[PDB]
Amino acid sequence: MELVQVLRRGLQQVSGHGGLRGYLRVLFRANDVRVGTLVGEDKYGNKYYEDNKQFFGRHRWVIYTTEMNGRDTFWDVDGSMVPPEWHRWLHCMTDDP
Amino acid sequence: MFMINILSLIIPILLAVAFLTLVERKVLGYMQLRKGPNVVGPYGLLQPIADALKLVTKEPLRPGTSSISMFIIAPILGLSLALTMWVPLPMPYPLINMNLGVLFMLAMSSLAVYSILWSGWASNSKYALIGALRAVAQTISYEVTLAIILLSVLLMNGSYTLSTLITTQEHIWMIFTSWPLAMMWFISTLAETNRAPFDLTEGESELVSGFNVEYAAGPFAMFFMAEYANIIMMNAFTAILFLGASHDPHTPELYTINFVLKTLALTITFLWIRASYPRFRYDQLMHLLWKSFLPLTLALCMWHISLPIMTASIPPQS
Amino acid sequence: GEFGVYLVSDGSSRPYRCKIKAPGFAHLAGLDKMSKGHMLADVVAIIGTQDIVFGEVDR
Amino acid sequence: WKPPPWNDVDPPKDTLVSNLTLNFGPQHPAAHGVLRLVMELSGEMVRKCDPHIGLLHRGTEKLIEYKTYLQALPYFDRLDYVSMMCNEQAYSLAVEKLLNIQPPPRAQWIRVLFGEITRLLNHIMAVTTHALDIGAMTPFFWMFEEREKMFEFYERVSGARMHAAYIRPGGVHQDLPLGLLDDIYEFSKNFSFRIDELEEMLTNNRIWRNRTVDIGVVTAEDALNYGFSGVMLRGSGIQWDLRKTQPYDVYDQVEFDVPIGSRGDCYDRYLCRVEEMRQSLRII
Amino acid sequence: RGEYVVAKLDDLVNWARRSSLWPMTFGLACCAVEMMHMAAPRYDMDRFGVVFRASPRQSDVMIVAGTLTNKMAPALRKVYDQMPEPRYVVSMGSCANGGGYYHYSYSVVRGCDRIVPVDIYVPGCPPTAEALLYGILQLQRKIKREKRLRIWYRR
Amino acid sequence: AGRIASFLKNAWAKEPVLVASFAIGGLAIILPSLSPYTNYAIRINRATPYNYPVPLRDDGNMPDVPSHPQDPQGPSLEWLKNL
Amino acid sequence: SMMKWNRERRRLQIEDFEARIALMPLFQAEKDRRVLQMLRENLEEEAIIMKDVPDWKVGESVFHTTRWVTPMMGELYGLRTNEEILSATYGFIWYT
Amino acid sequence: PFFDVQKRLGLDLDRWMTIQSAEQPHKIPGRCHAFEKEWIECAHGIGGIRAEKECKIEFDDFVECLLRQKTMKRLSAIKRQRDKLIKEGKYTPPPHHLG
Amino acid sequence: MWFEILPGIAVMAACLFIPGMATAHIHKFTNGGKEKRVAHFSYQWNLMERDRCISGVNRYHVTKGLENID
Amino acid sequence: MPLVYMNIIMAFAIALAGLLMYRSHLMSSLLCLEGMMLSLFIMSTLIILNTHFTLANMMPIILLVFAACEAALGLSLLVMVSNTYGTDYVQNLNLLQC
Amino acid sequence: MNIMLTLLTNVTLASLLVLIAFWLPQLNAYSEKTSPYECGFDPMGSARLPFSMKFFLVAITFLLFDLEIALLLPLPWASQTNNLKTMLTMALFLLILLAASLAYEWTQKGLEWAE
Amino acid sequence: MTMYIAFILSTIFVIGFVGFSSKPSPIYGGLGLIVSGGVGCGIVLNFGGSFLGLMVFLIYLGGMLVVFGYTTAMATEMYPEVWVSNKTVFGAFVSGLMMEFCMVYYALKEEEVEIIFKFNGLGDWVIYDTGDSGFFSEEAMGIAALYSYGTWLVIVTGWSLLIGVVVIMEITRGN
Ligand SMILES: CCCCCCCCCCCCCCCCCC(=O)OC[C@H](COP(=O)([O-])OCC[N+](C)(C)C)OC(=O)CCCCCCCCCCCCCCCCC
Ligand code: SF4
């Protein structure tokens, strides 16, 4: 019963990550395969998420954009492209985006 | 086609050893509530490749006071012996069906200490020298129990032919008859293979890196590959010895399933022990072996030699 | 242990000389006595229980 | 040629043995990175060990003569760096004593709460780091997950992780953020279990005991004469504790049991320290 | 052409070198305990593919973490010397960066770079654990932008 | 009596290992004499025909040896398969 | 359980051995014919090659007695190929 | 022996193994069981001096049985002449030589 | 969670999987479907040499019985 | 007699010479001594295996277990010499003289 | 045929595997790089001194102990003898003497080796 | 080739013996001796002595010579005396490679080598005996007689070994 449900979310994870392409993209680009509700999107492509069910920390997170100030950033990842106003919310310094 | 079978045996093990670094890194981390390698590829699958080809591209610095010929021969013996350890294994049908495979198994395992002694002397440093001397001292203390355990264990088997172990365990696991020896054999395998608490040979915290204190890059993997290859083989040797499996002649596939599944369970409990116990000490290392292990092994050997006679259950030598 | 600070005040807005009692200082001073009668693989053990954080012992 | 000696005991030559001066550390992982411990050894048996220290000696007191009292405060945070607040607790207690000014009672209670929280900080350091070198390294990571939680608490109040610089002469710099006591209350509830993980992991383990029991024992008289302090005396059964005998700050208006050992060896202190964890949890 | 082939070969070496470095934290001061803190399950370097390895003949990057004094100065350099190539040193904390809080004292060399060729300077007193984790990430990005095989091709 | 029981129990308090090994080795030597199966063990051990039982020249008046490996004459091991 | 299983194996072994006992007659006769036939081929080959030797009368009995001696492997396979030599001397010995 | 205690009290200590035609495990023979049995029974109750010359025939035959010197020399001379002849192409080995 | 290590060990099971399968199938393939007839004692060896000579093709594994005799 | 038997016999003889022709390390001398017995152990196996002296398969182990015993004595004397003198040299091992 | 062939293959596999681990990484060793590592400090000149007796004492005891166990490898075939009673008595003798050698060695200090 | 394979193993056995007999460094002498120890086992294996061949690997390669390395690690003469250190060892090593090369050529040509004994240089394979061993390995049955007929040897070998441990501790006790 429970094992079936745990399997059941797994395909739901595939549906959440835009089918196969998004799932392969995020796992090879962020090592994260967990999907949460959309919380915001800046003027950069920095698509943000949030999931209160996860424990403190990983409960809100990010996958970074592909284009940052005329720089390729699909493979590379840095924590500094986060804009200041959203840097406040992401570090849980304020829980309202 | 004997040749292609040989590469079909040594090549998968080397790739198995590479992946053993990843799983051990992750499992040990998981005990520590960590995650282990998961960034380099999906779930760290390419971490063994990353570690392997990074070290290969690192220069093999030879220490100034080293005999280069002496420095190089030791890894050759160490790695070749570890790969040779699998040639008599009863894997479906044993590759080298040596009628005295167990003796061949023990002789090669006991010859591995020459790598430890030679690596310490060739490095020519006090830290490496006493690291090696105690390393072999820990090493040479325990295989006498290994030999005694096997002699008692194999006594009810019938001979030293490794393939015969399958037919002996055709009904029940051989651990049930000699479970005092099973834990006796198991602990001694850690001491031979030098894992915690028997890691004073290397002693990452207090002996820096043991005999690998200097040994770097290129040929360092050889001891690392030989070490981890022995981990599978010793656990595989324990798997056949005590946790036997049924083998249908028309489907050797099935017994491979049982043998393989058991031998990862036996390797898993190896690093499971590592992630729970403090490291031992040289004196306790000898005292435990010579004071509480040797006497018990002797008595159990005495129990197991007379047991077939008092029960008229001697096994056929064939 | 017993971490004490001994300072002498000149009466100005600044201290004159500050002496800090380091628990590790006496403990590391006493490291010689404990180690007598024990092996090096126990010397590491004694160093652990001495709680010798060196910036504390080195003042 | 010389006729043989009458007793047949030909005279022994010069000494053919040495004590093998070994330069332990500083790169050695067990040497904490900065230890120049050099000892004399007859094989594994040791004769004398010289803890050559100074590999970290900074000006410290030398510059304090040039920094004002407020400017000198962050030095103590960096002096016994793993016990952040407990150092600046001493400085503030010292300085306010000269000023003949006592902090408000609210300030005192915050000091002791963080002081014992800092006691949790250090005792976790002392036990887990020791287990690192003795072998088993998983209690290290298990407790370090908790260590972040009070480290996070440090950040919520002072604004920095380690060097809080919170305890200033005359009290504390700022107030606790609203609800901060609630989170540390949640932490306090769950930490008793984490202590049980340590004791279950180590206390009864034979490998842990045999590497620790009856090791490095010292008698009460030598321990006191050696200038030892704190747990060093308490492990040897010495009946003494500063928080009890000379209760500074609020420590008089609180009850706790001092964990006096009864053997003086390393094991007795280890039980004393883990008991100090629980008694620290009493203070919280 | 040869440029494309050597580019792939450089990347193949590049990918492992930026994912398999084994740091050796030369634990000096309060900066060192922070690096053990980013060994905690909270950050767990090993998930990136780096392991705390002693015997600095095995390590690739070495981290000075804390103040560096004249007494510590000559030994620390020798650790850098027999550290095999490729070797990189990351300055942990203000004291290792530029002497920091003890920049004027008589016994600490102002800045660790006076002894070794610092690759990445990490500010902090102490740098919060993930700030160093950021610095390690910068190291791999810098490691990504090298042209070892490319330069030899034009050499 | 009192000393023996106390000493044995007291020894089992400090060392449980050698008393266990001494007990096992103590058993390992006596019951081999007391076992009723040792005679069975040597009987089946003798029963294994490693070598060929070379035929004996039939000159009459040895009825014990059979003239065919099916006759009732000669040694029989009907105990063995039951044993 | 093991004592029953071991007891069963001994019954299996003696059953296996008994088959070999019944198989000795045909095997012994076949090896008997083979070994002395192959010796005769050697003797026939001796008397095509030692005709010109100043002193060589074929069939010399190196042993003075008239009792049959089991033929040494040298005079048996000595005049055969290299495969015959290798597969006979160490053929069983190698057999990994 | 110097003091033949074995003979006096009749406990066999070593002589079970001094020669190869005695009792052997599983009744399997030595290489020269037939010859040495002949030599032994030839030289029993005779004396070392007399048995040296009288039972000479049984000895060198038995020595030749286990050394196999002249037999090996016989084969060597057979082989030596073979390659000293077939290399000249005077006689060709028949098929059964080559299989 | 721990379902992330199964990808690591599943590959491991595959690695140790190969040598068993190869030596089983090569023995089967080389020896005409049957397993490698082992000869731990000289009796079993001279059994094979009879088979190799009696097969008429100089391979022991080729088995041929009642179709021969007359 | 077969060529191989020369190889062990000559192996012993050259091992015998190394045992007698000394140098400055009686440690090296002990190596020739145990090599000396190894040829004895090896050669003894050839005749016994060749001649099928089944009960004589005994002595290769018996010769081993006793030649190995001399190692215990010899090496023990080694450290005894290397304690009153420190080293394993042989020229200095002449205190008797008269 | 196959036995040393199996031995041959592993040795070449090891030697080439170190060969491409030695010439490929483009060895660039210097004097300080090849200098011995001693906890990061200066070596004082060593690794050429005797080490008391305990390491030697245990080695000889192991050697003597290894020789007795060598005497008792053939037990699995010994159980297949016709006269078990003699074999049972004799094998028990080796084990109890193995015990006695351990027993004496224990009682007269021994395994508690020197320090 | 496989014609005279045992000719080979015997040859490395000689050169391995010449190695340590030339008195090289005790570890290097150990290296040369274990090489001879390794190759000698193959000679016994080729004769069917698997159990005897495997033992020398166990108690002589992994046995005696391991504790030999301890004394070499204990002796540690101030400089390695490896082959390049001395010139007599080269002469000893070079010499020991000549006469055995001489007599094999002497034995390979006419086979009438009369050094001390008369010796035939014929192929190693000849002296083998033809005959089945049934199911009982002749080597195994011989050794297993240790506890059937070798009663007397077992007592004396055991008693000496017991006396072996009493002497070793007594001489090493240093009064
Ligand atoms: C008719 C019945 C016949 C048989 C009866 C036999 C007696 C009854 C059974 C007795 C117990 C079994 C035999 C003894 C076993 C213990 C031997 C011993 O010395 O113990 C004490 C020893 C020593 O304990 P100690 O050192 O605290 O005390 C010994 C006594 N003094 C103090 C005097 C020296 O215990 C150990 O060595 C601890 C373990 C060390 C290794 C660390 C890893 C352990 C991992 C455990 C988990 C994995 C187990 C895997 C098992 C196998 C799986 C395939
Ligand atoms: S930079 Fe700051 S935290 Fe780091 S060692 Fe220096 S004073 Fe301590």
PDB file of all heavy atoms in Angstrom, chain C residues 43-57:
ATOM      1  N   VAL C  43      48.317   8.482  23.876  1.00  0.00           N
ATOM      2  CA  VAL C  43      48.683   9.893  23.938  1.00  0.00           C
ATOM      3  C   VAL C  43      47.678  10.730  23.160  1.00  0.00           C
ATOM      4  O   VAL C  43      47.294  11.825  23.589  1.00  0.00           O
ATOM      5  CB  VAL C  43      50.119  10.098  23.422  1.00  0.00           C
ATOM      6  CG1 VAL C  43      50.410  11.576  23.233  1.00  0.00           C
ATOM      7  CG2 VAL C  43      51.116   9.484  24.387  1.00  0.00           C
ATOM      8  N   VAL C  44      47.225  10.223  22.011  1.00  0.00           N
ATOM      9  CA  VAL C  44      46.178  10.910  21.263  1.00  0.00           C
ATOM     10  C   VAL C  44      44.904  10.994  22.093  1.00  0.00           C
ATOM     11  O   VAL C  44      44.178  11.994  22.044  1.00  0.00           O
ATOM     12  CB  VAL C  44      45.933  10.211  19.913  1.00  0.00           C
ATOM     13  CG1 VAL C  44      47.029  10.570  18.926  1.00  0.00           C
ATOM     14  CG2 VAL C  44      45.861   8.710  20.095  1.00  0.00           C
ATOM     15  N   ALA C  45      44.611   9.946  22.867  1.00  0.00           N
ATOM     16  CA  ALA C  45      43.417   9.959  23.704  1.00  0.00           C
ATOM     17  C   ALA C  45      43.508  11.024  24.790  1.00  0.00           C
ATOM     18  O   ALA C  45      42.541  11.756  25.032  1.00  0.00           O
ATOM     19  CB  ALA C  45      43.192   8.579  24.321  1.00  0.00           C
ATOM     20  N   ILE C  46      44.660  11.129  25.457  1.00  0.00           N
ATOM     21  CA  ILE C  46      44.810  12.126  26.515  1.00  0.00           C
ATOM     22  C   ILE C  46      44.694  13.532  25.946  1.00  0.00           C
ATOM     23  O   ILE C  46      44.056  14.406  26.542  1.00  0.00           O
ATOM     24  CB  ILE C  46      46.138  11.934  27.269  1.00  0.00           C
ATOM     25  CG1 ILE C  46      46.414  10.452  27.507  1.00  0.00           C
ATOM     26  CG2 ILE C  46      46.111  12.695  28.579  1.00  0.00           C
ATOM     27  CD1 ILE C  46      47.878  10.092  27.465  1.00  0.00           C
ATOM     28  N   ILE C  47      45.310  13.774  24.789  1.00  0.00           N
ATOM     29  CA  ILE C  47      45.218  15.090  24.164  1.00  0.00           C
ATOM     30  C   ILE C  47      43.761  15.455  23.918  1.00  0.00           C
ATOM     31  O   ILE C  47      43.363  16.618  24.064  1.00  0.00           O
ATOM     32  CB  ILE C  47      46.049  15.118  22.867  1.00  0.00           C
ATOM     33  CG1 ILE C  47      47.485  15.542  23.169  1.00  0.00           C
ATOM     34  CG2 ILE C  47      45.430  16.044  21.836  1.00  0.00           C
ATOM     35  CD1 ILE C  47      47.605  16.969  23.641  1.00  0.00           C
ATOM     36  N   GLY C  48      42.940  14.465  23.568  1.00  0.00           N
ATOM     37  CA  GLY C  48      41.527  14.733  23.362  1.00  0.00           C
ATOM     38  C   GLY C  48      40.821  15.175  24.630  1.00  0.00           C
ATOM     39  O   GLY C  48      40.073  16.155  24.627  1.00  0.00           O
ATOM     40  N   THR C  49      41.057  14.464  25.736  1.00  0.00           N
ATOM     41  CA  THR C  49      40.347  14.767  26.974  1.00  0.00           C
ATOM     42  C   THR C  49      40.885  16.003  27.676  1.00  0.00           C
ATOM     43  O   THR C  49      40.218  16.531  28.573  1.00  0.00           O
ATOM     44  CB  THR C  49      40.404  13.579  27.934  1.00  0.00           C
ATOM     45  OG1 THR C  49      39.533  13.826  29.044  1.00  0.00           O
ATOM     46  CG2 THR C  49      41.811  13.380  28.451  1.00  0.00           C
ATOM     47  N   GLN C  50      42.069  16.479  27.289  1.00  0.00           N
ATOM     48  CA  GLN C  50      42.621  17.698  27.860  1.00  0.00           C
ATOM     49  C   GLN C  50      41.882  18.942  27.395  1.00  0.00           C
ATOM     50  O   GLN C  50      42.170  20.030  27.906  1.00  0.00           O
ATOM     51  CB  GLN C  50      44.100  17.820  27.501  1.00  0.00           C
ATOM     52  CG  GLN C  50      44.997  16.848  28.231  1.00  0.00           C
ATOM     53  CD  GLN C  50      45.739  17.495  29.368  1.00  0.00           C
ATOM     54  OE1 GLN C  50      45.149  17.847  30.388  1.00  0.00           O
ATOM     55  NE2 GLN C  50      47.043  17.663  29.202  1.00  0.00           N
ATOM     56  N   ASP C  51      40.948  18.798  26.454  1.00  0.00           N
ATOM     57  CA  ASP C  51      40.262  19.909  25.790  1.00  0.00           C
ATOM     58  C   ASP C  51      41.235  21.042  25.487  1.00  0.00           C
ATOM     59  O   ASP C  51      41.019  22.203  25.834  1.00  0.00           O
ATOM     60  CB  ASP C  51      39.060  20.403  26.604  1.00  0.00           C
ATOM     61  CG  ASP C  51      39.401  20.703  28.052  1.00  0.00           C
ATOM     62  OD1 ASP C  51      39.343  19.766  28.875  1.00  0.00           O
ATOM     63  OD2 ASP C  51      39.720  21.867  28.373  1.00  0.00           O
ATOM     64  N   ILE C  52      42.337  20.681  24.840  1.00  0.00           N
ATOM     65  CA  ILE C  52      43.372  21.661  24.479  1.00  0.00           C
ATOM     66  C   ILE C  52      43.045  22.203  23.089  1.00  0.00           C
ATOM     67  O   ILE C  52      43.580  21.797  22.061  1.00  0.00           O
ATOM     68  CB  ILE C  52      44.799  21.100  24.682  1.00  0.00           C
ATOM     69  CG1 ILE C  52      45.169  19.771  23.959  1.00  0.00           C
ATOM     70  CG2 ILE C  52      45.095  20.972  26.160  1.00  0.00           C
ATOM     71  CD1 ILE C  52      45.090  19.591  22.483  1.00  0.00           C
ATOM     72  N   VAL C  53      42.158  23.193  23.068  1.00  0.00           N
ATOM     73  CA  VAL C  53      42.026  24.059  21.903  1.00  0.00           C
ATOM     74  C   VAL C  53      43.172  25.058  21.953  1.00  0.00           C
ATOM     75  O   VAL C  53      43.320  25.806  22.925  1.00  0.00           O
ATOM     76  CB  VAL C  53      40.660  24.756  21.866  1.00  0.00           C
ATOM     77  CG1 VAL C  53      39.584  23.766  21.465  1.00  0.00           C
ATOM     78  CG2 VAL C  53      40.325  25.324  23.214  1.00  0.00           C
ATOM     79  N   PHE C  54      44.013  25.044  20.922  1.00  0.00           N
ATOM     80  CA  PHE C  54      45.330  25.650  21.053  1.00  0.00           C
ATOM     81  C   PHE C  54      45.297  27.170  21.074  1.00  0.00           C
ATOM     82  O   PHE C  54      46.108  27.775  21.780  1.00  0.00           O
ATOM     83  CB  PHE C  54      46.242  25.159  19.939  1.00  0.00           C
ATOM     84  CG  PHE C  54      46.824  23.804  20.198  1.00  0.00           C
ATOM     85  CD1 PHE C  54      46.143  22.662  19.819  1.00  0.00           C
ATOM     86  CD2 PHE C  54      48.038  23.672  20.848  1.00  0.00           C
ATOM     87  CE1 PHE C  54      46.675  21.413  20.059  1.00  0.00           C
ATOM     88  CE2 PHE C  54      48.570  22.426  21.098  1.00  0.00           C
ATOM     89  CZ  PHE C  54      47.887  21.296  20.706  1.00  0.00           C
ATOM     90  N   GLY C  55      44.395  27.806  20.327  1.00  0.00           N
ATOM     91  CA  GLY C  55      44.272  29.252  20.433  1.00  0.00           C
ATOM     92  C   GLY C  55      43.963  29.685  21.851  1.00  0.00           C
ATOM     93  O   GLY C  55      44.314  30.790  22.270  1.00  0.00           O
ATOM     94  N   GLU C  56      43.295  28.814  22.606  1.00  0.00           N
ATOM     95  CA  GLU C  56      43.072  29.041  24.028  1.00  0.00           C
ATOM     96  C   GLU C  56      44.352  28.805  24.825  1.00  0.00           C
ATOM     97  O   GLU C  56      44.682  29.579  25.729  1.00  0.00           O
ATOM     98  CB  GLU C  56      41.927  28.133  24.485  1.00  0.00           C
ATOM     99  CG  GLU C  56      41.965  27.504  25.875  1.00  0.00           C
ATOM    100  CD  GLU C  56      42.164  28.460  27.030  1.00  0.00           C
ATOM    101  OE1 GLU C  56      42.232  29.690  26.840  1.00  0.00           O
ATOM    102  OE2 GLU C  56      42.196  27.951  28.161  1.00  0.00           O
ATOM    103  N   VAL C  57      45.103  27.753  24.487  1.00  0.00           N
ATOM    104  CA  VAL C  57      46.336  27.480  25.221  1.00  0.00           C
ATOM    105  C   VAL C  57      47.452  28.420  24.782  1.00  0.00           C
ATOM    106  O   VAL C  57      48.339  28.752  25.578  1.00  0.00           O
ATOM    107  CB  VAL C  57      46.749  26.001  25.068  1.00  0.00           C
ATOM    108  CG1 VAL C  57      47.515  25.765  23.783  1.00  0.00           C
ATOM    109  CG2 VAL C  57      47.597  25.570  26.239  1.00  0.00           C
TER     110      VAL C  57
END
